[model samples]
Target chain A: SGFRKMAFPSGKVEGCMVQVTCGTTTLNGLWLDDVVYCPRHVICTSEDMLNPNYEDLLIRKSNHNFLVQAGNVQLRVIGHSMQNCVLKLKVDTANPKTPKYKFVRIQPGQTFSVLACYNGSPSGVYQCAMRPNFTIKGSFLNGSCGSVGFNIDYDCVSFCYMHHMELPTGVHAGTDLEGNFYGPFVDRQTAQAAGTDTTITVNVLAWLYAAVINGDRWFLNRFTTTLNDFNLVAMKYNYEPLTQDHVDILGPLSAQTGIAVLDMCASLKELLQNGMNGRTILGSALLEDEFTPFDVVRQCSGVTFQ
Target chain B: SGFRKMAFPSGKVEGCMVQVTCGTTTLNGLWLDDVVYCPRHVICTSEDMLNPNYEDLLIRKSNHNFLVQAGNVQLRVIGHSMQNCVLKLKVDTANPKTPKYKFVRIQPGQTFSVLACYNGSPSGVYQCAMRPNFTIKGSFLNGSCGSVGFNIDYDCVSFCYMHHMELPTGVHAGTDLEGNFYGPFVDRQTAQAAGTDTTITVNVLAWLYAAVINGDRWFLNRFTTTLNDFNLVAMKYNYEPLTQDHVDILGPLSAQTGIAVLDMCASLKELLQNGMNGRTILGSALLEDEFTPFDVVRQCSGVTFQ
Candidate 1:
């Protein structure tokens, strides 16, 4: 709540760091420790601020259109406007292009779904508009269907894209100068109570720096040549890249840490150029009992064992 | 016999123009009228001079290796030099892999065909040699395996990389300076009998000019972006580009007509740059009953209709 209040201050405003919290304690910039910050921003805007209403109807055509069995027809309602408005849909699936009509009345904040019947597979277009004086066919002209419709395959799988480094946090990773465990300390007072150790933190940071640098160096270059290899792997494993908006959330924090991050990367590059082995440096940090070196490489490089 | 004698003169030699034959008449370049030159070369070598024998054996692993039913394990025997040779074969399909042996004596000109049972999926290498002393496995050494192996999928389709203009070849489309029906000539004799219909040939050439030019312009520019699109189209439609050798074969002819070809192409480009309609020009060339104007555009551009 304090972090949230500090982030917004009074209400929606810009250029304020959301008070950094480790667990329950808010670190209000008084004491800095072994902190690898991951930040996220929630921007309520344009479409987000508006009321939910079906303004435009988007039809997603299925690729499995040549099936003997009929499939579900999904209509995505975009934008804001309707109340208890009725929708009339006309679907053509033949050469004489036989037109089939249906009416579905959707309540506010409802996504429309319907079942379609096909005579000779699903060919042709699906036109929809508001009831009564609906002269426009094959997509609504002014009111809705302003944007393009989407096509989907029936067997298509959905995926979520999230790649996060499992950076060391809490207990065993670091300590204060007095050699007492400081973190997993949350409150600034708790952390400040213990003097900085510098040693363990540096070790952890070095380990992290080595892992990210080596992994990124090898894998990033490989991907330039591999091209669609990652995507093929993603499809086979059902993984995806983060959406643009999701990535945008971390922009501020990324920029803030950019210089240091690049410096660390360059340092690793220097080490590699000097003929220091990554396996010896980074792999030695993580004990075999905890995780294998290959595991660390895979995790850091975005390569998975699956 | 006359054409052959003229083509070779006395004996096989390089740089000799093959006698051109069109329908029932030989076009000795004596009379040029509506001449369509299709060239070919026949040069035989290697195995043609030697006697045939089981020289090298080839193994192609099937993807369906784990089948309960033993799918066809095809072994292609290539090259020559084996007569009454007793061959010892070792097939292994095991872990920590052990080699199981089977011996077969092959006749002078016989291909080896053997079926072996496996405990699990086919996972081991096949080793074979002449009964005396041979140690190598996988690929044979010092014979046919010295040459590179080529893999072309049997189910693959072939395509012509012909970017020729479908100019009206025979008669319906042109007239001579004398206002007489000159073409639709069957043989060189017929065309020679009618004399040179310079008007019709020029018209045909002009149409060819416009088609190749517009097609090359639009499609060529598109390919700078499309890249692998044509190859993908080729694969899907069971079509392939002309081999380098075939292209090499056309080098002399292409060079001979290269200037005129470029002139035609440049003329079409000039017309288009001067705001001439491709639909009206190239469209009028093809019969409407045969194909639409878009067909010509697509054919020229190498774009296909699904």
Candidate 2:
């Protein structure tokens, strides 16, 4: 992996101040201390209302009686028992020959409500089709009681509502040069699966600012992104940053890079293992410890720890 | 009309250090406050549950079904129409010869449940009274064929649930006497009703202590009582304090004095109020507004106003 400088948004995290650095050049950082983390979830309601009303055509049979006029009928059988059913009445006032019809299968212990409003020339006869499988008394029936021709009625549409996908209540993790990460965790076990990122120097520095300066949950999230973006941009700059500086740095850098990764992973693992300690190590590395300076000094000066 | 002193159990209000002086006391003078104030409403759960269970035995039903047996004849009538008809179950299980029975009336959109556990004892009929009077039909009903009962499983008690009370919310007025009258408003509103009372000497004094003392709501409530009580007791003694010097200094003595209510109320109120100002009111009320006269001057006297 190539060495990259990291940058983070300006802000105070808890009580710590975060800033981005590239070699010896320092750029002002942005503060995100006021932003709040908003976890998002989706829910839906009222969908069936979008369907048109369809009432069955009924023919008058005296004052109170009537029969549903000419239409091809279909039986729908439903349920585990498979014997309960409802009949669909398809009537054509204009064509009176071929008409549209559909059957609604009835399920045991389940309510069957349909928008029975079909008025035009395509109106159809509705019949309660018996469950094709069950033979018990009162188990099945036929078309709605003696109705003929089509009558206009308001169709009760199902609340044309869409089923919303359930948001898995679990933590999510994303990596940034600035290493603050958090996600909604449903349970301690489910939480460990999400919210982990590697530590870059820039990311680690941003984390230091957030965790130490502001102790603000909102600021932490933003600062992570800021530092990461800053580092990437700073690295792409045209400055002829010295190769001699690099030669001097690489000997110590290669020696201690593994230690940085270990420290980063350790902090993350600890955070995941124990919820935020109110204070935490950030990024995937341990970069801010007291020994960090001595280690760097020894690495650069080519001296032993002793 | 009569100067009489009576003592009674303080009830739960005892921890509040409350003492009500009814009629009057010559020694304590004519101290009065908290007139017509409503007691804090009690939220009694257990008592509400027991009352309705007792009312169920009075209802009677008159439908005869062969399926009804010797055990508790519980009728779980769940439907929409069940709410419209009245209920009068006449069952003489106690003695078939000249058996005694009772009848119950039900309204539309109400639940009809029987907790009559003893079929033979004529004690199996339990009824829950309708609240808010339910509508007999039009979809509020659940688990029913027609349009009557909303739900069949109605019980007398809702456990420990509390809904807002029907009575209008109110406040109370209180007073202290240097003939220093506070208000003619409800207690809660009294201080705020004046609008200006927000900064009045006594109100400000009470509020300042409330803020600094980390005073809980209950403590604030009772402390108001203490203020009132302090006034009453102090007035009784203020005129004829533990020492005659107090009377000579303050001037005028009324007959049958007990405690100086005004001096005490004023001194405590002023002390705490001025304490926040880091000063104290030092000269007597009778003294000149400017410096006290040479003969009457008290050493290093000062009056603090806040």
Candidate 3:
């Protein structure tokens, strides 16, 4: 962990946090596009639920498929207790013998390696493709042996779906939780990262003011296909959903929550316009990596939510 | 219009107004699925925008394709200014001569009749299918005639889309404008007043409290497909949208806009469970008809928005 300083009005404070990023990130359900398959009984937990970082937690929650929470977390890998018994990894659970990672023939307390099999010219390779944060650490445990009693300590890097990012006054730049649009971002980074923007250009105010003034339902459905494809449903530490119900049709949008949202949106727009600003559609800037975008505005605004 | 007494603590006053209703009513775009074919230059205006009944305003705006407002209303059918011209209604505009309504051939200053053409049945018929409120009523005047110099006085009953019905305290019972949901209602009258309830049974409290407490985006998408199919986007007179943004994570929902919404939802649920209550799931009881469902509690509570 490294320290990073945040400048606030009251004073300058510092923060040292592991990156916890969420977006439409791919976790590779099938390894290396197609290396390893099947997760029989793997789960995750947390010991540091209090100020817990998602660097390890997300890997356990999303890649392993468990109901996850922040603060403290632990990853569990279930295996057979009896020796000589085989736990199968198959493409088809019904046909357990076909198209599976070959981990057969092992004695109790014996160490064995996992073999990666492919259909192409590679046929069978004696190596398992290592995935980030999901690295296979441990071999077979005592009192059990292959294809059954084997267990691996693997770390994974998983990502959650972000509804919206928190702004200085409490507005967001992305879609809401139920997938309603507040405005859009020209993500210079993720739109292609390889060097191109994928998010279509939008006259942010046109979609925003229209949604507010005329109660346009069009903005409500303006989410992209990737918003639904995110594997994780957990909210980011600073998610503020922009639901339309709170709108006071008879009141000023600014007096209500909308104006702050609009103002914050403008702030983000200005950031996007600035020559030196980093890549972020709305939530914050990319602090550590893709998963650890920090809310620089809120961090410096002197309000601590985490 | 007739006198209708309402029950309130203030005092029971009488109400006499025309019926105005809205729903996923099929306003035969093709006319009885096969009747009238075109509206070249027919339009409507309103003298009753202040308290304009949608009965006629909806007809003009929806069928005529105009950005309409209501205060007062008038319906107009444009005609050929020159002598012996025509106002043709054709099934296919491209092939004007083929499969056209038999409103051809009219001499100057003579009354010309319209013929209904159908692919099925007795074919060419003199009786023009008179859609409700969309009836034709004028004939050849001086000059223009050849299925021309024609005009008609027709009264059409068009309907508008209903997002949600307003609750006395400010909740709604159907969908928000962006199509979010509070709960579902089984319409004993329209779920086929022919007799059947199609709204799947749901634990009202479960969907409600979950939405309020957990920020369930699931309930946010709980709207029926008909919501998108509504012909008009104008709000119902007493409509109130139920958006999700107003829900405060740290505040009491009942204290926030949510509790009133939830409370009102319960009220509507009770109305549904009751034996004596008429139709309407939330906003109010079905007062006059489908489109004219009034907010009984708000009305009787002596709060007037209309």
Candidate 4:
């Protein structure tokens, strides 16, 4: 091995890292005693070092019945996981007598798409597990095979249901235990390349505000419906003991909370009007490829996120 | 007849009227059109030069059972009717063999109060009608005895219910056909003497606003409750034919109309802060004597209107 330079697209070489794989074995870090004798592997940039980029692959059954769609299943990879690992879609048991499997690699950030079966397999149950040396940070279903495993019950239409994007738990702040922040960039140059270190707080706020704007009719109608029920009961019952169930439902819609939400909506509206895309406004925390058209509207008229 | 100084307590009267009653006969206007020889008789202020001030005596059964309360009958004279005519509460038929009756004279300005039976009639039905030369503008029950007639089932206690103040159908606006605005102050000095000419719109608004402010919890909770019911349904059904019955209930809370109402609430809040009473705010078109305590809270923290 020979000494080599480690740098991110942002031109930072602070904590760049590299993983090596050969045949059936995969190893992380350069295998050399001294920096002088080590050869540069040109591993991922220092951006991943700056920010501890986590991966989330959401697996869901598209349809339970084979009649509905021969092969209807979806796998969504979010954040830095897309390019870091190759996911293997395996049919039936892990080591089937006649194994049927396919490899998939998705664009980084928030991306998802419908996947079909390969190797002439009829509609049946399926599993998605990462190749060796990869990690899955989050998932809606139990992905328990070493890295992450998600099972799909193909041909089971009854299990198919509407889907929604999962949100990150909390904002990333300060430095990690190693005195480093996972920067906005990973090995993928085109994804979250520049100015992507925005906090997750703003990221979520931007998305929620967009959703509110996109679904204003639904939101306002909800508010109107809430008030109407109470109005009817009050008009008819006078001082009688009308059920407080409806009143309990209204707890969240006080003017105080409503005005606060309204303020946020206005802020997002202004932000969108300025022509600043959600990616640029909220920063590239996750890929948005698999977001539905309606979800896209929720993001805004401009934030398609490629 | 001679020239008489016609006047209302508030100020000079434009035109005056007269109703003559001698012995057993009640004569309306001049008996023989003999202005020179007829006796000086007074009636109502001559129909307001430009607007006619019609009287409306609302009749309701004070109690369902004739035994519930001995004198549990309410006679509410709206507009300037109470003083315009002295109503006679007659028990049973128009001319009940013995003519069991009692005379009730209420102060003007939409005045009403509990009236007792003076003729000592057993548990039975009763009727209230104008004695003579008087007219009733409106009544809940049919009033056709030359004035206003209200039939009361003395033993019918099941009919009695909680009471609410009656509201005038027409609001006092710009001058009507007559040169009057149907002023709250007619000839009754003690009634509406301190405050008169209150607009019904403002009156209702102030009451509603006060009720809203005082019960902010109730109002907001009501709003929240309505939305909650709708929220749960929407979440469960997604786009699969959401039940809009809840939404339809919210029809009255449209921003188109809600904004106007909010503005009024703010106005009332400001008015109360300034120590201006609701009567001064909306003027006194209706009396607060019969208003329930619950209704009183709706008029605002101040201005009990008692």
Candidate 5:
């Protein structure tokens, strides 16, 4: 791994990370060994449970149904046994009804592969057991969903994985054994370079202030069809059954979460808007692919390992 | 029974039956053996069917706990009986960790009452039976979750017996065959005045539409804490599975049912806007003296009801 410098309020710190560099410029990448605490998101260790970056821990929709290759994608969740941990896939042709999942468990540190299928298509998100029942989840973005649309990120929707780049690895997650790991931020410039370490801090006051003032929304802003479809339920995270505290704190946290989600969505939207202009509305899958163009772009960006 | 004038478009026609009253006063009541069609509801009789009124049905939330009373309600679907019908309730808490549900099923004409213990205050739109389960449906009020929001009346939220008000001896209702009833709507002034033959016609389009659209919503609007804690799940009138079309349609219909619901809501909004400046929020239960000031003004009158 290469050394990267990050400046915090305290001082500049050096850390080992992979850089998703394209041409002469560098872009955002996944973080290694970074843990973010929630209620307040700050990078820390297991001892920081109260403040753990519990913002979101979910398996997104697009992240499912894939061919598990060697050293690329990973997934994790807590369950009773190997079978309990393994996720069962189901497709719902019903318009307003979304697809659902069931999971299976496994022995820790064992390398295995799973074929992700949906409506006869290969799904990408799969887990490499890092520990008993814990896994690492990721996906391969083929031209599956469709063309990209309005996107702020130039390489938002490029598909196909690169050989040289690294894959995201998961430590222990979903159980009491090891606390949650935060970064899965895809390397925008590399297919295999994995992700660089970066901290996603959420200011509680700001987060709630936004939700309270905005009204109707709390804990999160409105997501697009893809995020709402894949990420929230299908992917690795979700935001439902909000607590009264969540509702109470919505004013600010909602505001902040809205910004973060919008920031992410705006990036995806930019990519999708572009796809809509040139392509016809073939089907929902294509529309989904177009919106999640970032999956492909992340693969293309040749992220460099130190 | 009563004697009244059949004031058709052909002018004043006279008819004598049970109770009689002369002059331009209201003939509000449904004692018994007094069948009355709804405001404009229509029903057809068949070999296996009884002479049930077109609007002897209603839809309500299960705030209290009780057995699914199928015998109390009546719904006819081609080959299905009350026992053949089933109701499914799904809850997504957003936390993949734990999910909760309050589901029950009953036969036709059966009434299910959820113990108030189950719902300290429940909020969420519930899926009642949809077409394919029944031939006739009703319209929804505007802002009633799109009771066909942008569409014409044909596409609006359809209603039938469970939501009707005029059919005193309903097809499927919450009333005892002997006449006793439970719940707020049952105690309404209109219901009491409903003499043996004085049927009350209730256009449930608006009411159902309101429940549909704002059913899942947590509040009347983003402003107050007053919840629209409606019947998310309860004993179903007829146990039937909702089709994918129902889910899709249900998602949109919760926007607006008809003009009536909108008017009702506007009136409530005006009351709140005026800061309750001696204005009244009306409803069957609100007029009762036992209810709290908040309960009357908040939950009941909170919606756009007639």
Candidate 6:
């Protein structure tokens, strides 16, 4: 509390570490046990600023803008006081096709905003939409409507930008081996269907993961690919690797050959069924358990795992 | 290209929103169809800063540090520059038990990194450890060890920070009705069991969502309480409220009383089986379909749903 901080957000299911980035700010307190840091410095001024919410410090972002324009559309905002602005005009010498655009006539001191609603769902964000509308509304001797007085206009995009951010956070099981990210599932059904159909191990792993998440017995009843699939794609995160000896000893997953044998589907099934006792089965099947070798063992039970 | 940008990350499953916070920064352009923007501004400087990774604009971070410490440990990095740094020493007048501390004698320029490793998993982030090292290794007449030179010390924490961020991104089905978040599931099994045992509707809904994701063939074999549970907890997302009239039209989720009667279990089953054709059944059971009112009728066939 005496000093500032930079906090990391919990990585949740992924349980993976993130790349570190920082900047010129220095801290008397340097680093912590924590890394899942989320900060509150969501904006800045003409000069660089700091966020009190930060757990520590760094230069996470630099040189960005709040508004944009297509081609060379000279749109500008100017003001003196009350900061009556948020509207402006685009002196577009380029595109005239969009010249005949829609406009809103908001009353003085009235408020208006642009919203971002999710597709078919009630969820959404109220967008900071004063830009483009400012360009088309009118030129400025008196810049913006200032959000203080009038409304500019409004619209919603179906393919929201949030999807880009949110999708990657799910228990994403698929990877391009090279670590490329596509997006998260829009829904479990789509995720499962798409992942299952692909021959790519990661895609299959992703589908299996999605299937497991969706509680899909229909596929479990027929599908049999297992941890072998996970391992094939797993080679992608090769830094922490099992040696040839480890792999040879581990063998290919079969009751006869592999050091570890698992009916991966059944493992997940028990995961769904047996709670802790079932977790033991999963742990055991995956080849790490307290059998004769370990003194501790959990002989357990469940509502349906039996 | 000409300027910079700010962005938002996809809000993912919690597709709801984010609060607005910004400072005195002006943009030539302001906002977009994409609020799911993810700007790279993760840290800050002595001055407020913005991120270029941003698609449009906004100052996302301010006043923060890259490192941290505890108590009144007078630690500082003084230098003309890194010129060389990343290490220092802490002179804690308050804490003594931890005074002896761990230390490393790194070669000048030979890199030393303190890594933040995920428990059991190979994933980890190499922490910026130069700060505390700078304090303890030796109170530099010269400031930092200068990541350019030697090392300070090292350690790892099992409980990572990424979880705080990653878990919330999952497909969370339960809510406090008051919009409070309690972090995401550690695993699908735990999520289901814990949610299912609760009398709370949101917990039950959470269980249902988790159950659906895990494919608990055992539980679905025994449990009932369906979409009606969803509706009860669903009230929390009340902004897009349905009126009593709509509720009256909708009834309860029963064949005898409610407008929407669903064998919700069977519907999810078809989702696992029929795919698209089955999706219609889910759509139908959920009560949105083209029956007599709409001209199109989907006569479906399936691998198992048949």
Q: Where does model 1 sit among the CAPRI classes?
A: incorrect
Candidate 1 retains true contacts at a fraction of 0.00
Each prediction's whole-model lDDT (CA): 0.19, 0.19, 0.20, 0.21, 0.20, 0.19
| Quality class of the docking in candidate 2, CAPRI style | incorrect
Candidate 4 residue lDDT tens string, A1-306:
000010001100101112222122222211111110001111223353233333321122111111110112221212111122221122221211111212223212221211111111110111111111111112221111111111111211111111111113211111111112223322232323223222222223324433343322222222222234433433442311223442342223323235343344334333333423222221122211223222233212211110
Candidate 6, residues B206-273: lDDT per residue as tens digits? 22233233222232322233444534433442211223443333232222221232233333333333
Tens-place lDDT per residue, model 1, A48-162, is 3233222332122122221111123321212211112212112222212111222222211111110010111111112111111111112111111101111111212111100
* Superposed Cα deviation of residue A104, candidate 6 (Å): 40
Clash-forming residue pairs, model 1: A176-A196, A176-A197, A177-A195, A177-A196, A177-A197, B159-B240, B170-B184, B171-B184
The C-alpha RMSD of each candidate to the native structure, in angstroms, is: 30.3, 36.8, 27.4, 34.2, 27.1, 25.9
Q: Which is superior by lDDT, 2 or 4? A: 4
Runs with alpha carbons beyond 4 Å of true place in candidate 6: A1-306, B1-200, B203-306
* Top TM-score hit: 6
| Candidate 1 lDDT over residue span B1-306, tens digit each | 000000000000000111222122221110011111111100112332132222322122122221111122321212211112111111122111111212222211111110000111111111111111111112111111101101111111111010000122211111111111113322111222322221111222223433344332231221121214333433442322223342343333335335333333234333333423323333232211111222222222322100
Quote model 1's TM-score.
Answer: 0.15
TM-score of candidate 5 to 2 decimals = 0.17
lDDT of 2 by residue, B25-80 (tens): 00011101211111111111234322322223212211322112222232221211
* Candidate 5 lDDT tens digits, B133-251: 21111212111110100000111211112222312322112222222222222322133222221100011212333333332222234332111211111012111222333334333
What are the per-residue Cα lDDT tens digits for candidate 6 across A130-211? 1111111111110110101111111111110111111111221211111112232221123221222111221122223322
lDDT of 3 by residue, A202-253 (tens): 1232223323332222222222222222111102212222233222321243
